[PDB]
Each structure stands twice: as structure tokens, then as C-alpha cells.
Amino acid sequence: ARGPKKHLKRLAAPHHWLLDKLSGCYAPRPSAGPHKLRESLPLIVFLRNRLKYALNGREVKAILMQRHVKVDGKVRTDTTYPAGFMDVITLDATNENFRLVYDVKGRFAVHRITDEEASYKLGKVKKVQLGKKGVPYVVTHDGRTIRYPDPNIKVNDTVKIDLASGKITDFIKFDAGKLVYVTGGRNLGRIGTIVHKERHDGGFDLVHIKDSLDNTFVTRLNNVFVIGEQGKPYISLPKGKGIKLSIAEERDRRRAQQGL
Amino acid sequence: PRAPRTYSKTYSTPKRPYESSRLDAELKLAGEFGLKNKKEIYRISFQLSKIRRAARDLLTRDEKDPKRLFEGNALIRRLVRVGVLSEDKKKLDYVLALKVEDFLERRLQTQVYKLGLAKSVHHARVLITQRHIAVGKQIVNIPSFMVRLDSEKHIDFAPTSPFGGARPGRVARRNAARKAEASGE
Amino acid sequence: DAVTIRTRKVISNPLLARKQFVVDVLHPNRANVSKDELREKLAEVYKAEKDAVSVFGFRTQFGGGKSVGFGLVYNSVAEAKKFEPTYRLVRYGLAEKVEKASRQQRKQKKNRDKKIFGTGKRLAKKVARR
RNA sequence: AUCUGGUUGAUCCUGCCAGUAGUCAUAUGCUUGUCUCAAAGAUUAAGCCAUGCAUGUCUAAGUAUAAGCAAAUACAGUGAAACUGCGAAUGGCUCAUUAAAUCAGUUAUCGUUUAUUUGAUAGUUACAUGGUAUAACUGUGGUAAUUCUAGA
RNA sequence: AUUCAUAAUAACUUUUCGAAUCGCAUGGCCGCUGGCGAUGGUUCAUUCAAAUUUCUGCCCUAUCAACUUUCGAUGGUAGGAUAGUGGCCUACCAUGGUUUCAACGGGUAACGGGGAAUAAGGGUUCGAUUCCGGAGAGGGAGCCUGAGAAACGGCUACCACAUCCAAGGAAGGCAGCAGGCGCGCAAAUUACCCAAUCCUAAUUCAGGGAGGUAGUGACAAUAAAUAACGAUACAGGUUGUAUUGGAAUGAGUACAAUGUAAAUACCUUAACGAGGAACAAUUGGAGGGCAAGUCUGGUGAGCAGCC
């Protein structure tokens, strides 16, 4: 290739979008933006495929150009704008708010939230450094840069951000006994508490997690996102609390309830 | 281009063509159940072959292996639903004892004979293809349709036919008209 | 026999000022029902003007007797006229078919014009003199 | 999964052959009623090509005195041409070359560039400057000829 | 883990940037002051990316046993060039580097991989071709514009072909779509459309042979018609063999609606539509391997994978 690529063939798209095989030759390619391509969710997929508010790609554009949809409090009109983990989406008519968060299968859920919670989002701290003239700043996973952080904040900590003004109001240290959300790999979507951490100089650190049914699993540190103290999430959790079930357990519950 | 459509072949051919003893056994089934081809027999033995392959594999796994529990129960459940396996023989070792006649016995073509309605397996086939039989509300016209145990209560003549309550057919109507017209002569 | 119409999976959609739903029809002893008849009966049950009702995509069950499709009803005739595709409006007679030339002819005109620089009122005069 | 036939007048071996079944493996012959689904100038010649088409683009928001159309004395609706900005480096086709090369899994940049998107970020040096300027346009022309273009 | 981030001092530059721009609205205080947006701009971070790079892995050949160093082969110091590391190139200096654990040379009717066929197990054969990566636009070389190209639906030259002409000159690249010639055992229409999937632009609106629809199509795959049932006569224990009677239906055709961007077809349906139901199923065989003729007429070229 002689430059950047503009098209994404279907089948090459991320599997968690749950596109069907046969309806066309192509898939929507996400624009450059706050989140990585492989793990974003384009607005067209949200409005059309999940909420069913639109029948066509054409009807999605008719919605956006009326300026009904805003993301993190700002109006967006690009059909392929890449929303991602922890973003807040608001539809003013209908009076609905959603937060993007994973099901335990590792798919973006349709999760409704109150008008109160729509004020803020969480952010994972990716680096902390001095800028020009010696002013310190922090960088979050969604690419915000915030001036004059509290001197205690360090990498891997988590930070609470007011969506108006865009300023830090609280933070939590990375430490044992915190709640965590897993955001990558085979265990994507599980929740548990930190048991301990393994140092590997020049390598990748590993973290040991325990869930409330005291199953245990291990993941690379890059996949771990802190979300609160033990038993006290800073945000409303999706239905099912991130508890993984075996295939035998799922079959029993369905035919018990759905099968009466 | 669009993603490929998948497809697969549904029958297997016997590897020795002129094994005389086999030719006799096949012809008795076709005469008994009113089949039109050997292929209709090959299709069934092909399905039965794969069921045994899967079951025989699972029996190498220990009991209380989670995979043997999950998939073994599914297979048994699925055969009981169509009535191929008795709910008394509801155990995996008995799956290896099934034979071809257990499946042919469940085809819609033969059930419509055992219930009455028709009066030979040859008469039964004609009615199905000519759209006279319904299962529930739906008209069905495929003889090889496997009748699940629930459906047997609901096999009856279609509402939109003679024998089911509709108008007489095209030939009956023609005869009445000519005779009526002649009776006016 | 009397026709029965039912609606299912009803969604209200303020973002496009419409309601959208499945249309399910039982019609024993007739081939099917015309879209024009369905538009009338839906109009009176949802208390709407007929021009605000749109209906598409039907198929009928094997062996007959039943059909299924999709239906829309807009909050006004004006809003329908802006959100609806033009081809559907033509079916209802709410719009007039446009009369462009065939696709091959338009393309050939374009390629002829690319060879002219400027408006071409000049050049014509020069050729007339030759 | 575990076949059958062929070497003395009469047998048993070695050995190979013939038969049998499959092929998202091609071709070809005879024959052909219904529903669903669907590959298709790779193999020989990365050989040669008539004709048509396949890349352009405007919003309330860069530049309007068309001698365009349609009806607030600087202008104000709609809008051809042309200047300006952006794109044409994506897509589509083919398999000639190429044997530690390409490629696959796994690493590194404390060894470097990056239109665009997103977030931060410049008190420090006239009530509005000039053509060292020109297109479209008006008007005079050249050549058998092209998406040729000269002088004013 | 740093001669990191960042800050300070003395200077340097041929002097980088630090808004002479556009829409809508018309408020506050007694000619001053004010709102919501658009487009630009320096540096840092982020996103879409690029370049280089570590480890291990490839088909046949010894009728290829020694190979590289002039003309960079292996290494050291300094410089040049590059976005940047490095014999990448130059000057000087040293004499190194690979190999029977197969180097070097030759062959491939060789693009790599995910994969495909063949099911006891182990294997054998194949992968031009729907996804990922590389390369090329008749053959070699060079370069402009740009963030990005050594671009070919951009330019310049040479080599090989080849078009028009007033003979002075001018113009060229289907291994894009459709189509033609040639080749061969071997492969479709110079059709309709942006309605869907998506992409580009100053953009809801324009454009797209990308893509979709129909035509051709026994490559391969799924379902499945060509007849069912009585009477009579005869024979047999309810089953065979021949004159005779009512019923049933789609193949096909067609009003209509549905389908579709508009259509064709499928699904549904008024009317019509079977008695030699001529509305008539073929392709290979009958010594053995290998299912099935001591039949009957002719003859003394034919048959046969094998006997």
C-alpha cells in the first residue's frame, strides 16, 4: 500500500460487533478518534443494530443531522465516530442515557443509567509527566490531558472526571482489595478483587484476581481497570454483576425459568 | 466479494456395488415403506453412521467428565423428542443399538398410514404430495418430514381441500355441470 | 370472510416522529389483501390521516391464509413527506416521478463537457467563421 | 480399517498387474420436467487490443455586476463558468519475479516520520496596507489535426 | 536502565510562529461593552499509520566441496548522506567471515499463510482463486507534486510494438467492467440501478462498471412428479392375472394482488388444463472378477481394462 486504507471488508471486522455474514460486502470503518479501532463501537452499529431505532444507514444520518445525539455531553454528527468503554451517550428526546460497558460474554451491553450518573466518567491513568514551563499533566485511556494533577496520582490509578468543565474530582490508588474490571483477553468482562501482583522487570506484570464466588484467574496488568473499593462500585454495574457461569449452569437456569 | 455460502453432501455410496445379499435387504425396505430410490436408504444410513461415531467417541471419556455430561445428554434428549429412541432406553449405550428401521418408522408418509386416513403406503404418498394433509395449521407436502412426538395429535386433512371441507375439485365440478346442462335438455 | 389485522412489537420512535411495528394479517378464502386496503384500516385504528400511513415488505405463508409485513405511521402528513423515501411516496401518489435521461446518456454528456474550458460562447463563434 | 481374479498337466510362495470406491479435479459423450442455492479466460500466451464507460466535489458559514433566472441604492433569493480548498497513494485486477527472500507466531524503537480525529496550549513583536495581479468575461486571431493556445 | 522529562547561563538565524477571515443573533451600561458558531495556527499528547528489527521454522539436487575479498568481503576510528540506526557511502587501518550439524552452485510446469481432498491410527497429495501479507501495470531507468508515490486511468528518455496525416507534424499502454482477435482439451451480456452495503468531497442533497439486479450456466450441492383406488371375470387363500367406473392433482396458461428502484421469477389465487392419463425416462450390461440368458435368427468381420 502507498498510504492509509479507507475500507474495512466484512469478516475482517471485530467479532463482538455481531454483524451477519451475508447482508453486504463491507463493514463501517471507524474514524480516527479517542479509542483504538479494534475495540471501539461506531455509532451506526449502536443506533441501527442494537436499539433498532433506524432501518438503514440513510436513516441513521437523518437522526444525527438533527443533532439529537451527544457523546460525553458534546454533539457529534460523524456516523462512524468511535465511542468506547465508559463513554456516556445521551438521547435528549425519549429522555434516555446509556453507559457503554461489557456483558460477561464480552459484548457491549445496552445499559441504562439515571440522569444523575450521566454527569461523570472514570478514567485510567496512562502516564504522568512534566510539560513545557514545568507544568505537570496526566493522560487518561480515552486520551484526555489534564493540567495540575494531585501529586499523589501515579500510573495505573483511576480518576473520576466531571464531564462539564472536565476536571478531576477524585481518585483511587491501585492496591490489593480493590475492585477491578477486566477489559481485554480471554477473561474480558469479569469482575473481582486483586489478590496480589507479580513484578517482572523488563516483562509484563501479572495480576491475580478473585471473584465473589472465589474463583481465581490471572491476566496481564494492561487488561486491568480499577473501578472502586471492595463491595462499593463507583458506577452502576450491568445486570448479572460480571459473574461467569459454566455452560451447564446456564442451561439449567433457562429451562428452569424460560422453560418454566 | 460476499462471504461464501456453505453447503454439504448428505449421502454415502456402498463401497462394493454387487454384494448380492445386500441388494435383497434393501429392496425389502423400499417395498415395505414405499420408497422410490436406494438413495432414500443411503441417506438414513449416513445419518446413523455419524450418530454412532459421536457416541462411540464420548464413551472413551470418563463418567463425570463435564463434556461427556453436557453433549451426551443433548444427543439422547434430541433422539427421544422424535421417538426414535424409547424413553425407557434413555441411556447412551443403547444408542449403539439403533437400526435403520427405527428412523423410517417416523416419516410422515408412514404415520399417515398407521393412523388410517390412507389405506396403503402408496396411497399415503399421493395424498401428501397433492397437499391434502396438514400438521397443526400448516399444510405439509414433504414425505420425509420427521413427526415429533407432540405433533401426532394434530395430523388431519387440510381445511382447503375436499376431504377437509372445501369445494369439490375441478373434475367433479365439470361432471356436475355437463350432467346438469344435459338434464336441462 | 372477515379479515383480521393485528400489530406486534410496537415501538414508539420520537427521533423520527413515527410508530413502527409488525403487521400480521389473517385472510381465509382470498388470495391476499392489497396495500391500499391495509392503509385505510390502519389509518382509522391509530386515528391518523391516510397520507401518514406507510406499509411495505409482505410475503404470504406457504399454503396460504396468512401474510406478514411491516408498517409505519407518522405524527403528521408533513413529517411523513420529509422522512419517507421518494420511491414509496410515488407508490402512494404523494410525489411525481422525475424524468431524467438514461444512466448511460448522462455519463456520455459529462465526458463531452470535460473537453471544453470556459463557458463556450466563444469558440462557437470562431467555428461559425472557420 | 483387514477385498476378488491372473505364472505346473497337477501345488505352495515371491512379485507385479487387472478389478473396486471417493475427489469444493478438469475435460468430454448421450439424456433432461419442478423448487432453493451457486463456481465461471487460472493452466497454453504477465500474448495483442476497435468502441463506450470506470473520479470528482458547496454548506447559514472563502471569492458573484452572467449583459443567467426569479421576484434593504454597497450587497442580501437561486445559480452556469472560473479562482481557492480537499480528494485522486483507497478500491478493483493478476501471480511474472522471488528459496532465510516473502511469510507465520513472538519481540524492539532508550533508533524515527506522521495530513486527519480527539484533548490541552502563545498579555512580551489599526475605524484596517499594496499590486511588484490575474482567471472566468469582452474583443481580434493561427493550424489538416488533439482536453493546442497567442496578442489586447 | 540514560547525556530522560524539564529548568538555568552566554550567544547565534540568512529570521519560524504569535488571526488585516466568514455566518447567525441584537443584549448591557450613559459610545463604551457583549453571545452561539465556522475556518485557520505553534508545540505536546492521542488515534489511523509507516520504516527498520530479535528468536525459531521451507521443496529437489554431491553426475555441485570448498566459497567471499580488484569493483565492501568481516571488523575498528573519523566524516558525509538519511526522518533516523547501520559498509548505507568515502578516507585510513587490521585480516577477517561461512561449511559434511551440507556452505557455495544448479532446478522448481514455486507468491507465503488461514486452508482443501482422503476419516482406524500414523500419513500422502494439493492451495493461480471470496480473508490477511507481498509484488506488478509491455521491458529497464529517472523524477515532479504531496502528510503519504520511485504512481503508470502522472510526466521524461531509451528498447520493442503500433495509430492518424494535407507528409509539415500529432497522439499511445484493458494483468478495471462489457466486448474482439490469437491460443488451446479448456471458461458468460458491448444489459438495468445507486433501492441495500459502504467510501469520498466545501457535503443529509452530488458521485461511485466499488457494489447490487436481471441474462447466459447439467462445476458442485438441497428437496422431489412420471399415478392412486373401486367393480367384474379367473385363480389362490385376504394375494396375483385381464373388461369396466367415479374421484384426485401440477406441469403449463392466465384476471388480480403481492414482490421490486422499475421489472422477471418464487409464495398466494378467479377461469382453463389427462386414459395408450402420445402430458410416452434415460445410460450401460447379461462366461469369470461382478447383479442378470442351455431363448432365438444370422455369420464363420468383430468383442475384450485382465483371463
Side-chain angles (χ1 to χ4, degrees):
Chain A
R2 291 184 273 126
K5 294 199 294 179
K6 309 301 183 177
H7 295 78
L8 179 65
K9 293 185 192 166
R10 199 171 274 233
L11 304 183
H15 184 265
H16 69 83
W17 292 355
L18 299 177
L19 301 183
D20 66 289
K21 285 199 300 176
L22 296 182
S23 59
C25 193
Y26 295 109
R29 186 174 168 94
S31 308
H35 290 280
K36 282 190 166 74
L37 187 159
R38 181 56 52 168
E39 60 182 39
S40 67
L41 181 69
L43 292 177
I44 177 156
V45 184
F46 193 67
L47 268 52
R48 186 177 64 189
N49 299 51
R50 296 292 178 280
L51 295 180
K52 316 298 188 185
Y53 286 139
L55 301 180
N56 302 299
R58 189 189 72 89
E59 293 197 335
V60 176
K61 197 182 301 185
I63 292 168
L64 292 175
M65 297 305 296
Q66 290 175 82
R67 317 185 85 241
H68 288 304
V69 179
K70 59 181 65 176
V71 185
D72 292 357
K74 299 181 70 72
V75 173
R76 303 297 179 189
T77 66
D78 180 8
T79 295
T80 55
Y81 186 80
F85 181 71
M86 206 63 66
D87 293 350
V88 179
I89 296 181
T90 294
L91 274 56
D92 189 18
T94 80
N95 186 16
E96 300 196 277
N97 311 91
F98 311 90
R99 193 182 294 280
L100 292 184
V101 72
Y102 301 107
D103 276 337
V104 74
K105 291 291 186 296
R107 307 166 193 147
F108 285 113
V110 178
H111 176 58
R112 287 179 170 80
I113 68 178
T114 64
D115 197 23
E116 171 62 16
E117 180 169 335
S119 310
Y120 65 89
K121 78 185 303 186
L122 268 53
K124 174 174 176 178
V125 180
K126 300 293 293 180
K127 61 178 55 161
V128 62
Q129 184 157 8
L130 299 191
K132 304 297 291 176
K133 302 185 182 296
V135 181
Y137 64 88
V138 285
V139 186
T140 59
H141 76 295
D142 64 338
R144 302 170 180 265
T145 68
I146 306 176
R147 293 292 209 80
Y148 297 113
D150 185 319
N152 287 176
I153 295 172
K154 304 292 178 179
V155 181
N156 312 307
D157 298 338
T158 182
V159 165
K160 189 180 182 181
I161 300 171
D162 189 10
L163 292 181
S165 81
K167 295 172 64 72
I168 297 174
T169 66
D170 201 8
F171 72 94
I172 305 98
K173 286 299 201 71
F174 186 102
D175 199 5
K178 268 47 176 160
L179 275 176
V180 299
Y181 222 122
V182 180
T183 62
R186 180 169 166 87
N187 288 294
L188 168 63
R190 294 180 78 168
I191 294 174
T193 59
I194 297 170
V195 182
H196 78 283
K197 173 185 168 189
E198 297 181 28
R199 172 172 270 282
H200 290 290
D201 299 342
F204 306 99
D205 295 357
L206 303 180
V207 191
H208 291 250
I209 307 301
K210 184 168 60 74
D211 67 23
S212 72
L213 270 60
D214 59 76
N215 314 274
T216 56
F217 55 94
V218 183
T219 63
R220 286 186 179 188
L221 174 63
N222 182 53
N223 298 340
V224 186
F225 193 109
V226 177
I227 68 172
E229 309 298 343
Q230 165 61 326
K232 296 181 176 70
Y234 270 54
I235 60 180
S236 58
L237 295 182
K239 187 270 197 292
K241 303 298 198 297
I243 303 299
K244 182 173 175 285
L245 294 182
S246 76
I247 59 181
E249 298 292 348
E250 293 188 313
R251 180 253 280 131
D252 288 352
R253 287 186 180 202
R254 286 175 185 156
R255 71 187 168 162
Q257 297 172 215
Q258 173 265 16
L260 303 173
Chain B
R2 182 175 59 79
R5 184 83 68 165
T6 196
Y7 60 87
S8 64
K9 194 183 182 188
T10 58
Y11 71 99
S12 182
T13 296
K15 66 178 186 173
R16 289 158 63 178
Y18 304 123
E19 185 172 17
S20 183
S21 59
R22 178 177 56 68
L23 303 179
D24 295 344
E26 288 170 1
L27 183 57
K28 288 187 180 179
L29 294 180
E32 175 172 1
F33 291 100
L35 311 182
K36 76 161 287 184
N37 275 331
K38 301 307 188 69
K39 191 187 292 175
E40 279 164 309
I41 302 167
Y42 298 171
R43 178 164 66 192
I44 298 292
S45 70
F46 178 83
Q47 291 167 208
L48 180 57
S49 178
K50 298 198 301 173
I51 288 166
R52 288 187 184 161
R53 191 217 68 76
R56 189 172 64 236
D57 186 359
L58 289 182
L59 288 167
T60 66
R61 312 289 287 237
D62 197 8
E63 282 84 47
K64 312 304 187 180
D65 180 319
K67 189 177 183 184
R68 178 171 165 189
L69 290 174
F70 189 78
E71 297 200 336
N73 292 2
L75 179 60
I76 291 169
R77 194 280 294 199
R78 200 158 62 223
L79 289 174
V80 174
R81 192 186 186 194
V82 292
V84 169
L85 183 68
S86 173
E87 81 297 337
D88 188 15
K89 308 302 298 190
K90 198 173 177 281
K91 179 178 294 290
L92 190 61
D93 308 62
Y94 299 127
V95 175
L96 301 179
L98 295 173
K99 60 176 61 182
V100 170
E101 297 95 311
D102 301 325
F103 294 80
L104 267 57
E105 189 62 23
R106 299 303 302 159
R107 294 168 69 257
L108 183 66
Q109 184 181 345
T110 181
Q111 290 301 117
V112 171
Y113 172 52
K114 308 306 293 186
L115 264 55
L117 303 178
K119 69 208 303 176
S120 75
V121 295
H122 295 282
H123 182 54
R125 196 167 177 136
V126 164
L127 296 177
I128 291 164
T129 297
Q130 295 182 358
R131 304 167 61 116
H132 294 99
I133 281 70
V135 182
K137 297 178 184 177
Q138 183 58 64
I139 291 182
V140 180
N141 78 332
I142 289 107
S144 64
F145 176 103
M146 284 282 173
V147 182
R148 299 198 295 227
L149 285 175
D150 301 335
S151 304
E152 299 188 347
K153 304 188 304 293
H154 302 152
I155 304 179
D156 202 6
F157 289 119
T160 66
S161 73
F163 326 131
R167 70 197 296 222
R170 93 183 190 222
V171 64
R173 293 193 313 262
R174 198 223 297 268
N175 288 343
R178 285 179 179 171
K179 189 167 63 181
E181 186 259 31
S183 302
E185 189 75 343
Chain C
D1 303 10
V3 176
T4 294
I5 299 164
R6 301 177 291 187
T7 56
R8 293 186 161 199
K9 298 179 176 283
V10 184
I11 290 169
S12 53
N13 184 352
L15 307 177
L16 293 172
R18 71 188 189 200
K19 290 187 179 181
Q20 60 194 53
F21 46 79
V22 173
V23 180
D24 174 294
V25 190
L26 301 170
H27 58 68
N29 296 19
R30 55 181 290 169
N32 48 32
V33 302
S34 183
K35 290 189 301 296
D36 196 30
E37 306 304 327
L38 294 176
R39 285 181 66 227
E40 290 186 7
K41 290 183 176 183
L42 290 170
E44 69 174 18
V45 70
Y46 283 101
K47 297 293 185 294
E49 182 58 282
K50 188 185 178 179
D51 303 341
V53 183
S54 185
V55 167
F56 56 89
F58 285 71
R59 174 162 281 259
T60 178
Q61 189 73 9
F62 177 82
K66 191 191 305 181
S67 296
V68 181
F70 204 80
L72 309 176
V73 57
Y74 288 90
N75 288 351
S76 71
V77 181
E79 280 148 315
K81 195 168 291 187
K82 71 179 292 179
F83 294 130
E84 202 70 354
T86 62
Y87 74 89
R88 290 188 194 155
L89 295 181
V90 172
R91 292 182 187 170
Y92 307 149
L94 298 177
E96 296 296 342
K97 184 66 175 182
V98 71
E99 290 287 6
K100 62 178 66 179
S102 72
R103 190 167 170 68
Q104 296 211 36
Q105 287 166 295
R106 303 195 308 260
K107 285 177 164 188
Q108 291 186 159
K109 182 183 290 285
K110 183 201 66 166
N111 286 341
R112 284 195 292 265
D113 291 355
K114 284 173 65 178
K115 307 204 306 177
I116 306 301
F117 183 79
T119 211
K121 297 214 309 287
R122 194 176 175 278
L123 182 61
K125 292 166 59 178
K126 174 173 156 63
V127 169
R129 184 172 64 84
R130 67 269 182 281

